[PDB]
Symmetry: D2
Subunit: 248 residues, 4 copies
């Protein structure tokens, strides 16, 4: 049975992805940073259906002198628990404003680290430790071509992640490792956001006036790691219900 690492897999989209891949035979590594309780409950729920089919792994993905080693360990964790690592899902991601006009480098460290630099180090480590079906799926953002005002640093990071998806896809093709991305448009809203506001956002979606559910995002991810996407590498699969096509 193939093993999969899911960053930020304790809740929301990452959680849904960890469950989908597990439902498909995958022995899923549930990485987290602050959501220990949720990660613990997930690993228990999964291992309940299948003994030793899940383990958790804690690690801060923000930029720092320890990041590199942490990423090596996150990957090494999959090998200790399952003796292999077939899939890596870079889902973990910080998201908040960094307005240009009125601490910053701490925001830079967290935004750039989780969205771009960690995935890089993780992909790198994942590759050097490697037939079967090896692949990486990066979680992008279909709306970054339309930069949300005040989110410059996050936007930059996601663009860097996009560049990493293509650079790694080409460089790793010879190693039989596919590298793709799933770019949601509007998906799980912030739980604290007022319903009125959530509704205003849902109505903007051309297809169904609704955000993508975590399961619909996981549908796309399951496909890219499946055999049905065996010739697919370097592609970013948009799942936005046509949101990016609408004009202001």
């Amino acid at each position: 049975c193939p093993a999969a690492v899911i960053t930020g897999g304790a809740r929301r989209i990452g959680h849904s992805i960890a469950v989908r891949l597990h439902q498909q035979g995958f022995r899923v590594v549930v990485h987290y940073r602050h959501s220990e309780g949720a990660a613990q409950r997930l690993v228990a729920e999964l291992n309940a259906a299948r003994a030793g089919s899940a383990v958790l792994c804690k690690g801060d993905l923000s930029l720092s002198s320890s990041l590199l080693d942490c990423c090596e360990d996150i990957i090494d964790c999959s090998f200790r628990a399952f003796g292999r690592c077939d899939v890596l899902v870079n889902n973990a991601s910080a998201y908040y404003p960094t307005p240009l006009l009125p601490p910053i480098d701490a925001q830079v460290a967290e935004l750039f680290g989780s969205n771009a630099v960690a995935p890089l180090f993780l992909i790198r480590a994942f590759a050097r430790r490697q037939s079967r079906n090896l692949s990486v799926v990066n979680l992008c953002d279909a709306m970054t071509d339309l930069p949300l005002p005040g989110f410059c640093v996050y936007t930059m990071a996601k663009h860097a992640l996009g560049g990493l998806t293509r650079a790694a896809a080409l460089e790793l093709a010879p190693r039989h490792i596919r590298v793709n991305a799933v770019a949601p448009g509007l998906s799980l809203l912030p739980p604290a956001m007022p319903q009125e506001t959530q509704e205003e956002y849902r109505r903007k979606v051309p297809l169904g006036q609704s955000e993508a559910s975590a399961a619909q995002i996981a549908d796309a991810i399951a496909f890219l790691v499946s055999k049905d996407a065996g010739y697919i590498t370097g592609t970013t699969l948009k799942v936005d219900g046509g949101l990016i096509l609408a004009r202001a």
Copy 2:
């Protein structure tokens, strides 16, 4: 059971797609132009497997005074044979050089008709004649961004098809019809091409140094039509083994 129309579905990619959707319970209308034999052998094979599950339809898709009605009849052929039409696959495509420097308007009529205008009329007829899962999949070309020298017209047509995919996607969103596309890189080579030449082409693909099989392309189309892509509309799915990433 649902019904799907596959233009140019008598052989190669279009054949693999008709077979695939049929294997998933679809009733198929196999359109063709000159591949009368294959069209017949396929429609019979499918009917052998399932009585009254496949019909055929002959037609030219080049620009002309009779194109509009031809497309209406192709779609109408699905409603007559099965009383319904849920999926439309725009696979039919003319492909050949049109060098700017040493008949042109005839080439423009055939290249643009098959690759863009016909798909336009087809989607139009399809949408006007329409819960279920209605979707359209256009067959694009991942390499049209790197214009093959001498294929100016073909390239313009495919580009028009991409605009069609997104324009229709948004416009038909309220009608619950999803419009997406699959963009192969190097797939089935011309049967007349010498092996030496075919091998020079295959070797350029980063992932495995091989062209995409028809089944691998059929895989992406099947995914975009499946329920696993219910939130996807207006997206082009590249299936090129990283080909578009390599520099000359």
Copy 3:
């Protein structure tokens, strides 16, 4: 002195380009279809500043059996008047809705003809009839990525023109003919449109809440035809005040 052909140069943007190039020393061929009077007033004004520096030319660019020859004559017009043709500016364009749901092929003929096919035949003739600084500038649309609901055919046509800009750029490079494009976002509004509606459009522009003047667009074209863009080919220059960057 170099000669330039400006399609649809009788009024608005095309008129401003014509004048701008003339002011830079170009001998111009003001082409029109129905605005003979505006064309004549322009050609008259230009020749008053420099004798024999401007001639007008009439022709319909819609698809028809006469299109190929008409485009040939438009280019042949530059050579008859000035004995040369150094610059081609594809600005003439048909623009109106073509909703998918409640004559079409005549709309296709006009929208595809003026926006895509005529430019292809004109570039073809221009290239075949050829150191200096030879270049072509296609007038695109920055918002065609966010398809305006109900303008499917127009959008497809402009995409085709984009595909042409690049295919021609690469294929004509060995002939030292550069092919580029300018893509306005919101420029000259319809003269009939109510000031209320015009103002609602203006306020959407992030940079100044104003549409682009004909001159500003002229500035971009002038730059692309100049020596200052001698290494530029196959590029599309966006001029939208950041309009394409805003979210709905």
Copy 4:
């Protein structure tokens, strides 16, 4: 007289850009890190032509605890020597391999700092310290869509810069600051590269089989800072001689 800041302006492209803006009346800050001799000679050359029209500023743009402060001083320099800053050219850039398969974070610090994070901190400072004509121009890379194997981190950083170009453009529009980019394809080759190798690279450029000269790149930047681009913001101007258009 407006004042401009040019990072990495001591040699090659940055040197040519500084000279070009200076010729247009611009008071140009020449930033450098290691090329003290060169920077000193350029400023002397410039002042010699116009007393007090040039000054230099030293600063490492790699990621570090000092970067934020350093970038602030770079912008501050323009205000100290000219009491104003109208133009920022983010030209400084590290470029070298970081292969995925056989110190890394130190490479990430140098590659991401110079190409993406410093520009971010510089634009941030620049905007906070501000009619006239304010604009930023980022030096991008037209080929980063075709990731050069082995240059992953450099590629990711340039992608982040492209993201910055668009996010900043939209966010600073209300403040009247235009943010654009110039993307060279093949320009000045490494001085130590053998001619044979240099020739191989040159022959790949479709337009003239030659790399772009620093002056041709400088031309594009001079246009984007000029009044002739007053409506232009958020656009990346490719200057590649058609290179990005050729298939492998």
